[PDB]
Protein backbone atom coordinates (compact mmCIF):
# COMPACT_ATOMS: atom_id res chain seq x y z
CA UNK A 1 0.00 0.00 0.00
CA UNK A 2 0.93 3.61 -0.68
CA UNK A 3 -0.20 7.04 0.48
CA UNK A 4 -2.58 9.13 -1.60
CA UNK A 5 -0.85 12.10 -3.22
CA UNK A 6 -2.13 15.65 -2.64
CA UNK A 7 -5.60 16.41 -3.96
CA UNK A 8 -6.30 19.48 -6.07
CA UNK A 9 -7.78 22.02 -3.69
CA UNK A 10 -10.89 24.09 -4.43
CA UNK A 11 -10.51 27.71 -5.45
CA UNK A 12 -12.28 30.77 -4.16
CA UNK A 13 -14.95 31.57 -6.77
CA UNK A 14 -14.16 34.79 -8.61
CA UNK A 15 -17.00 36.65 -6.89
CA UNK A 16 -19.80 38.82 -8.20
CA UNK A 17 -19.15 41.94 -10.26
CA UNK A 18 -21.29 44.88 -9.14
CA UNK A 19 -21.89 48.03 -11.15
CA UNK A 20 -22.43 51.03 -8.90
CA UNK A 21 -25.30 53.30 -9.78
CA UNK A 22 -28.08 55.62 -8.71
CA UNK A 23 -31.63 54.27 -8.81
CA UNK A 24 -35.13 55.68 -8.74
CA UNK A 25 -37.77 53.04 -8.01
CA UNK A 26 -41.27 53.81 -9.29
CA UNK A 27 -44.45 52.03 -8.20
CA UNK A 28 -47.86 51.99 -9.82
CA UNK A 29 -49.67 55.24 -9.05
CA UNK A 30 -52.78 54.69 -6.93
CA UNK A 31 -53.20 58.35 -5.94
CA UNK A 32 -56.09 60.16 -7.64
CA UNK A 33 -55.28 63.27 -9.64
CA UNK A 34 -56.22 66.28 -7.52
CA UNK A 35 -57.09 69.83 -8.57
CA UNK A 36 -59.08 72.88 -7.52
CA UNK A 37 -62.61 73.70 -8.67
CA UNK A 38 -65.30 76.24 -7.84
CA UNK A 39 -69.02 75.50 -7.65
CA UNK A 40 -71.55 78.22 -8.46
CA UNK A 41 -75.12 77.26 -7.64
CA UNK A 42 -78.28 78.59 -6.01
CA UNK A 43 -80.21 76.99 -3.20
CA UNK A 44 -83.86 77.42 -4.18
CA UNK A 45 -86.43 76.75 -1.47
CA UNK A 46 -90.19 76.92 -1.93
CA UNK A 47 -92.05 76.55 1.36
CA UNK A 48 -95.77 75.79 1.37
CA UNK A 49 -97.14 76.81 4.77
CA UNK B 1 28.31 37.08 16.23
CA UNK B 2 24.73 37.27 17.39
CA UNK B 3 21.87 38.32 15.11
CA UNK B 4 18.16 39.00 15.34
CA UNK B 5 15.48 36.61 14.12
CA UNK B 6 14.46 39.26 11.58
CA UNK B 7 17.81 38.65 9.83
CA UNK B 8 16.70 35.10 8.93
CA UNK B 9 14.14 34.69 6.15
CA UNK B 10 10.85 33.25 7.41
CA UNK B 11 8.98 30.37 5.79
CA UNK B 12 5.59 29.42 7.21
CA UNK B 13 4.32 25.95 8.09
CA UNK B 14 0.92 27.46 8.94
CA UNK B 15 -2.04 27.14 6.59
CA UNK B 16 -3.79 30.48 6.21
CA UNK B 17 -7.52 30.78 6.85
CA UNK B 18 -9.19 34.19 6.78
CA UNK B 19 -12.58 34.26 8.50
CA UNK B 20 -14.37 37.60 8.73
CA UNK B 21 -17.51 38.31 10.71
CA UNK B 22 -20.81 39.11 9.04
CA UNK B 23 -21.27 42.79 9.83
CA UNK B 24 -24.30 44.38 11.45
CA UNK B 25 -27.20 45.34 9.21
CA UNK B 26 -30.04 47.76 9.94
CA UNK B 27 -33.48 47.16 8.41
CA UNK B 28 -35.46 50.39 8.05
CA UNK B 29 -39.28 50.35 7.86
CA UNK B 30 -40.34 50.10 4.23
CA UNK B 31 -43.82 49.96 2.70
CA UNK B 32 -44.93 50.13 -0.92
CA UNK B 33 -48.05 52.05 0.16
CA UNK B 34 -48.91 53.41 3.60
CA UNK B 35 -52.42 53.24 5.05
CA UNK B 36 -52.82 56.91 4.19
CA UNK B 37 -52.07 56.12 0.55
CA UNK B 38 -54.46 53.14 0.52
CA UNK B 39 -57.27 55.19 2.05
CA UNK B 40 -56.55 58.13 -0.28
CA UNK B 41 -56.75 55.92 -3.38
CA UNK B 42 -60.54 56.04 -3.02
CA UNK B 43 -62.25 58.64 -5.18
CA UNK B 44 -64.99 59.61 -2.71
CA UNK B 45 -64.73 59.20 1.06
CA UNK B 46 -68.22 58.70 2.49
CA UNK B 47 -67.27 60.08 5.91
CA UNK B 48 -65.79 63.30 4.54
Curated annotation (Swiss-Prot), chain B:
Residues in coiled coil: none
Post-translational note: The cytoplasmic tail is phosphorylated by the viral kinase US3. Phosphorylation may be linked to a down-regulation of gB expression on cell surface.
Q: Which residues are glycosylated?
A: 18
Q: Where in the cell is it found?
A: Virion membrane; Host cell membrane; Host endosome membrane; Host Golgi apparatus membrane
| Family membership | Belongs to the herpesviridae glycoprotein B family.
| Function comment | Envelope glycoprotein that forms spikes at the surface of virion envelope and binds to the host cell entry receptors MYH9/NMMHC-IIA and MYH10/NMMHC-IIB, promoting the virus entry into host cells. Essential for the initial attachment to heparan sulfate moieties of the host cell surface proteoglycans. Involved in fusion of viral and cellular membranes leading to virus entry into the host cell: following initial binding to its host cell entry receptors, membrane fusion is mediated by the fusion machinery composed at least of gB and the heterodimer gH/gL.
Q: How does it assemble?
A: Homotrimer; disulfide-linked. Interacts with host receptor MYH9/NMMHC-IIA. Interacts with host receptor MYH10/NMMHC-IIB. Binds to heparan sulfate proteoglycans. Interacts with gH/gL heterodimer. Interacts with host DEFA1, DEFA2 and DEFA3; these interactions inhibit viral infection.
Protein name (database record)? Envelope glycoprotein B
Q: What is the protein's species of origin?
A: Human herpesvirus 1 (strain 17) (HHV-1)
Gene name tied to this protein? gB
Amino acid sequence: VQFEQPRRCPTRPEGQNYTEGIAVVFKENIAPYKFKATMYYKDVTVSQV
Amino acid sequence: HQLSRADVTTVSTFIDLNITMLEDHEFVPLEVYTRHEIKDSGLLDYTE
